[PDB]
Design a protein around this ligand. Structure first.
Ligand SMILES: CCCCCCNCC(P(=O)(O)O)P(=O)(O)O
Ligand SMILES: CCCCCCNCC(P(=O)(O)O)P(=O)(O)O
Ligand SMILES: C=C(C)CCOP(=O)(O)OP(=O)(O)O
Ligand SMILES: C=C(C)CCOP(=O)(O)OP(=O)(O)O
Ligand SMILES: [Mg+2]
Ligand SMILES: [Mg+2]
Ligand SMILES: [Mg+2]
Ligand SMILES: [Mg+2]
Ligand SMILES: [Mg+2]
Ligand SMILES: [Mg+2]
Ligand code: NA
Ligand code: NA
Lengths: 361, 361
């Protein structure tokens, strides 16, 4: 009902983008083609959680708010375009993240850079184009909209936030006091920065702003219902669900086979400050902690297997359920406080929470 | 007088950026430090032609326009910030370009990714941050300015244009009909796409929009004098100077020693559709053309030396002066047509033209 409306607007956006390249950017048909496959491979294939949040939030408000048929048509269209803005922004992140994480598979297919006729050299620019598309979309479809200014200001701050998060994420396996562009960076030995506080910082910026804050508040913008809600609660609900979503993603990088995921894990091999590792060091004994340090951050399969072993043995799925329960408490609690000013946005969050809580992919 | 005012505003912008990271983005001092060196290494060291165009254009108008001392202070400050917007945007391009071109040296120092304690993995994100800074700067300093909307719309279209240009540039050594993400790309053999038309297309988008259009029109924005000029002429003067600037850059990649440049050329090794190569094929005989094809697009030093040889022999500096003369004609001509509506912007262009025409670095 909304999903089919969503995916129809992509074709409309893609055509307006690719035609503009012909009529303004002197593009030859083969490059226009290349960019079509690029767009397809990088924007489609995923869960569309971020996009469909914008649309579900908008639909929410359209059931209680009196509008003419045309305005209802307009709000539903803006919401899909905004959804695609966020989806193109994630396309951009994944392309760039994959190169940064040396990944092999993504959404069941090879990573964009790993495509034989792409390579790292082109993918980098492809990523930049994906970003650039978000803005052309915005200015084109939203030029004459009351919400343009807010939308763009939020957007570019969500984006900055994400990139700051990546910085924390790719340097999470270095000792802070050793960071220096002049000197090649040695991987941590004491793992003293694998603390819940430092991990929560990584996840906040690299995930929660663009995966939760942005779509929720976006769907409010297209509805012009930003005043109708309590931001401090929206900020808090988004950061809490997002941290969970990332904790989820972390557990799956270890335990969920790529056949279902469908990407191949790299968190152990890459020395990532993952949820699994932090929790482990938060409970392990001296000897367990010792074996970890001699086997983590290495691409050697048996050393990765030694780490996967230690995680099963250290019974981490138990610390997961104590965290999951603690989250549902806090999530349900935060939804209650929202039922006051904005009942329609509370159930919107509830739906996004259910989607998130029961995801496996 | 303006240069010293320019460089003072960088320190002010850098502090506002780095403090915001402390007070909003939970940054630790060592990462704040890292980003300071990153900012410094990537934004400073260059000619500041793009930034100083914004300021020279603004100063131009401030000599003829009646303003209070405070408004003069304000316009000069906006112009420096805008200048840094474009300078941070180029920082972003160079970081990403260097990885894409496999470069070794930049502004007399190693390329950002080549720094021992950086690597390709971090530089990619550093590039994204550099971009993201342009927008935070904008929204912070220009929130309450009449010109914000135009500035941002122009900016994101200049940026898209540049990235489309890069696409044309990194795939300029492939046959169009062979482009395919599924199949690894073979380098051209017939060089049929090395035609002035195809080259002019590459340069238009990858250089002229961000190096000339953007600063010129930007300096008009901060002055609010966009109506006071003829855009079709501004567009045309910018594309013509920019193509020249790029032709300049191309010649220097071959002939200007890195000791002065100061970067190391990669155009021959990388099979770049450079000005030199196109002009060569535009004049060479059958046998000369034949030797080129067996020696171009190769990192082998002697094969590069065989190509540098053919360029001297084919007397390309002669085709340069016929082009340079043809440009000064057209540039001086276009300046005349501007003297009508906007005399102050004409001399601004004249100054930028002199700066460009007599650059060696
Ligand atoms: C360039 C900004 C990228 C933001 C990071 C995206 N987070 C997703 C990544 P992760 O951060 O490596 O978990 P993946 O999908 O698990 O590979
Ligand atoms: C990512 C967009 C980059 C725009 C290209 C910048 N042009 C400068 C490059 P070029 O395009 O390789 O000549 P360089 O300074 O000569 O290495
Ligand atoms: C940011 C993260 C952790 C990516 C994981 O799956 P996503 O839901 O984000 O990616 P899609 O497959 O839905 O694009
Ligand atoms: C875009 C090109 C051709 C870069 C060459 O020198 P620039 O003038 O652009 O670079 P700076 O050293 O001034 O930053
Ligand atoms: Mg990652
Ligand atoms: Mg990853
Ligand atoms: Mg992950
Ligand atoms: Mg290049
Ligand atoms: Mg280059
Ligand atoms: Mg060059
Ligand atoms: Na338009
Ligand atoms: Na601010």
């Amino acid at each position: 009902a909304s999903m089919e409306r969503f995916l129809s607007v992509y074709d409309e956006v893609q055509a307006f983008l690719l035609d503009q390249l012909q009529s303004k950017y002197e593009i030859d048909p083969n490059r226009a083609r290349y960019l079509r496959i690029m767009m397809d491979t990088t924007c489609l294939g995923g869960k569309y959680f971020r996009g469909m949040t914008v649309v579900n939030v908008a639909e929410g408000f359209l059931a209680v708010t009196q509008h003419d048929e045309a305005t209802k048509e307009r709000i539903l269209h803006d919401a899909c375009v905004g959804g695609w803005m966020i989806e193109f922004l994630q396309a951009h992140y994944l392309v760039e993240d994959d190169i940064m994480d040396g990944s092999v598979m993504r959404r069941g297919k090879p990573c964009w850079y790993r495509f034989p006729g792409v390579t790292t050299q082109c993918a980098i620019n492809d990523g930049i184009i994906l970003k650039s598309w978000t803005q052309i979309m915005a200015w084109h479809y939203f030029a004459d909209r009351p919400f343009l200014k807010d939308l763009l200001c939020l957007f570019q701050k969500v984006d900055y936030a994400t990139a700051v998060g990546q910085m924390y994420d790719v340097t999470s396996m270095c000792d802070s006091n050793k960071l220096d562009p002049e000197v090649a960076q040695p991987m941590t030995t004491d793992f003293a920065e694998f603390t819940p506080a430092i991990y929560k910082r990584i996840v906040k910026y690299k995930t929660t702003f663009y995966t939760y804050l942005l779509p929720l508040v976006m769907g409010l913008f297209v509805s012009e219902a930003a005043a109708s809600v309590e931001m401090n609660l929206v900020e808090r609900v988004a950061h809490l669900i997002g941290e969970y979503f990332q904790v989820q993603d972390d557990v799956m990088d270890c335990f969920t086979p790529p056949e279902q995921l469908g990407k191949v894990g790299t968190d152990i091999e890459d020395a990532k400050c993952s949820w699994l590792a932090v929790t482990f060091l938060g409970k392990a004994n001296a000897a367990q902690v010792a074996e970890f340090k001699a086997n983590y951050g290495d691409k050697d399969p048996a050393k990765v297997a030694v780490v996967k072993r230690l995680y099963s043995e250290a019974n981490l799925q138990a610390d997961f359920a104590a965290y999951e329960a603690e989250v549902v408490r806090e999530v349900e609690s935060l939804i209650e406080q929202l039922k006051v000013k904005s009942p329609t946005f509370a159930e919107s969050v509830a739906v996004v929470w259910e989607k998130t809580h029961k995801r496996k992919k």
